């Protein structure tokens, strides 16, 4: 079957400048008739994917004209003039001058941002949850930029590695930032155990961690 | 308006098959070849097979040839998929799509997808998720805005489905992707309002798990 390499992997551009996706093969895509199946997809967040490009240069019905195709033999660019924020998502070359039909592994287009610091909150067990003899401290990071971050819990001044679960969304197209979640579970008993729960984060914004805590007790 | 409509997530057991379908409407069902994409762990696109509804004509990718069945039912617009002996691999999203390239003209028609459908082969069984509150004590942003958030832990299978105030709250709003851990998912969202909104105002958390047949709403209280 045809391989077919995309490259970058991902990409990073300012709303206003042009990006240039390149996609090579592994066999010429000139079929026998003289013409080249060579077409471009974008796949936006939590969509399905949709053309953008066929026969290596022509745009297909209601796609903008910043978006241009060009290329020959097995050598191929998608090349975006002016970047916009719906141009954010993966793009895929896919070739079907051989059969069967293959598909480039994709190259992720992020919207380059200022730099966001991120806007932490931290969460104690619920009733309903202790009650189950469970209890989980949730910490959320949002809207910061770049995605690169490093979360870390401490209980009583000791790191906890154990028992962490963290998730974290895609670039949000209204602000281009990324959010995270990082919730750390422990029995019922452990947890009426310690003192301070600690929510600890590292971020290009900051030459220092970035805390978020609360000391549990009662009255 | 041109639409194709796919089936509903599922679950399979190890060996057994599923028969997906891609129901459409807006164009002459028989006129067009159909085709099937399989998606994994995100980009990772393989063509499967396409159909002409009109003859029945299929031509398959040799790696599907035994695994994939392609039918079409003209007096229903619906094009179906039958997968067999189901394994680790065939976990993916599968898309059906109105591809649009005209043999005859050598040119193309505006390309259609259906939404997808998800197919998870497993042998863990069916739990209900368990929907706790998060109320602030220290995530509570202080004044002029504070933030919420609504824990879903514990099910299986995926998907779940979760809005803020029946959907009326969706701006502020993130949710984040299940991950699975020891059989089970745990999924998570945060929404942030107005100091002046909440406590005032209710703030409630509404969850789905279809699999599981559980809705269940949590009020987000001090
Ligand atoms: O995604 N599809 O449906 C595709 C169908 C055909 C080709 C060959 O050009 C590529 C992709
Ligand atoms: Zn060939
Ligand atoms: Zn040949
Ligand atoms: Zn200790
Ligand atoms: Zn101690
Ligand atoms: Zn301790
Ligand atoms: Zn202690
Ligand atoms: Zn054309």
């Known amino acids: 079957d045809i391989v077919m390499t995309q490259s970058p992997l991902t990409l990073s551009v300012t709303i206003g400048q042009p990006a240039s996706i390149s996609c090579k093969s592994s066999?010429?895509?000139?079929?026998?008739?003289?013409?080249?199946?060579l077409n471009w997809l974008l796949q936006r967040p939590g969509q399905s994917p949709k053309r953008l490009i066929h026969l290596v240069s022509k745009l297909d019905s209601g796609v903008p004209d910043r978006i241009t195709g060009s290329g020959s033999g097995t050598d191929f660019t998608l090349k975006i003039s002016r970047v916009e924020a719906a141009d954010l998502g993966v793009y895929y070359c896919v070739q079907g001058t051989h059969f069967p039909y293959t598909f480039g592994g994709g190259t992720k287009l992020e919207i380059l941002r200022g730099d966001a610091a991120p806007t932490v909150s931290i969460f104690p067990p619920s009733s309903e949850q202790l009650t189950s003899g469970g209890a989980s401290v949730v910490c959320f990071l949002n809207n910061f930029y770049p995605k690169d971050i490093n979360v870390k819990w401490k209980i009583d001044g000791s790191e906890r590695q154990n028992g962490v679960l963290n998730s974290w969304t895609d670039q949000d197209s209204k602000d281009s930032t990324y959010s995270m979640s990082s919730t750390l579970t422990l029995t019922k008993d452990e947890y009426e155990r310690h003192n301070s729960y600690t929510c600890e984060a590292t971020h290009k914004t900051s030459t220092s961690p970035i805390v978020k805590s609360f000391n549990r007790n009662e009255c | 308006e041109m639409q194709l409509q796919q089936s509903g997530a599922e679950l399979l057991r190890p060996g057994t098959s599923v028969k997906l379908s891609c129901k459409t409407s807006g164009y002459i069902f028989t006129s067009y070849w159909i085709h099937w994409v399989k998606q994994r762990s995100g980009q990772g696109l393989e063509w499967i097979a396409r159909i002409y509804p009109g003859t029945g004509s299929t031509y398959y990718n040799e790696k599907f040839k035994g695994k994939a069945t392609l039918t079409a039912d003209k007096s229903s617009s619906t094009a179906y998929m039958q997968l067999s002996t189901l394994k680790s691999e065939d976990s993916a999203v599968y898309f059906c799509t109105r591809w649009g390239f005209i043999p005859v003209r050598e040119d193309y028609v505006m390309d259609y997808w259906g939404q997808g459908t998800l197919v998870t082969v497993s042998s863990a069984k069916t739990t209900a998720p368990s929907v706790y509150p998060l109320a602030p004590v220290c995530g509570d942003t202080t004044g002029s805005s504070v933030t919420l958030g609504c824990l879903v832990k514990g099910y299986f299978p995926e998907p779940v489905t979760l809005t803020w105030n029946s959907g009326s709250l969706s701006s502020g709003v993130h949710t984040f992707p299940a991950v699975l851990q020891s059989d089970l998912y745990t999924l998570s969202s945060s929404v942030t309002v107005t100091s002046s909104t909440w406590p005032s105002q209710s703030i409630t958390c509404n969850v789905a798990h279809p699999a599981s047949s559980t809705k269940v709403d949590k009020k987000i209280e001090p």
């Open positions: 066999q010429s895509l000139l079929y026998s008739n003289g013409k080249t199946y």
